[PDB]
Amino acid sequence: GAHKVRAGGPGLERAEAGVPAEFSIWTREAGAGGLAIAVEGPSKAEISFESCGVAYVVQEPGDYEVSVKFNEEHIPDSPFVVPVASP
Amino acid sequence: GAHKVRAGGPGLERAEAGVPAEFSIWTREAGAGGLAIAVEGPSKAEISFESCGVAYVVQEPGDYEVSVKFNEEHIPDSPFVVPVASP
């Protein structure tokens, strides 16, 4: 049921180091399950939840990958490649 | 004051891989302290809070142990042995 979860927003295509990057996840059509957000790149992220919202901050510029996985399977289009600009 | 915390619910006796398993924790009689929920078994869990609720998902079938610890002491009946069925 990972194909039923979708995500979108500016934080899945660009960010800026030190500036929260945001996107939403659409949950209405999805079943129940575990939802994991990971960021992988040249530095560590803080990632918060808040359909749901996700905000994340990385501290260094570089190319990052954001995955959204539902019961350990990539949703459509995950992983997202996000270039992160210098602050 | 760990003996004053109690927990119960279907998620302390069975689960299904990929399906959120749920139980509640009764906090009314308890003091203030740190409350930790751990799941230990053949795969990793996502565990959320939501008296309080706990929902967790594991991805593989097998025997798991769920502990609820208050200031690092098992509450009554913790650890809970939970067989997890295939999805």
């Binding site: 399950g33 749901c52 | 996502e46």
Partner: peptide, 11 residues
Amino acid sequence: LFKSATTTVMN
């Protein structure tokens, strides 16, 4: 190669 992750349960 750093990984950070956060997790929730969807009901």
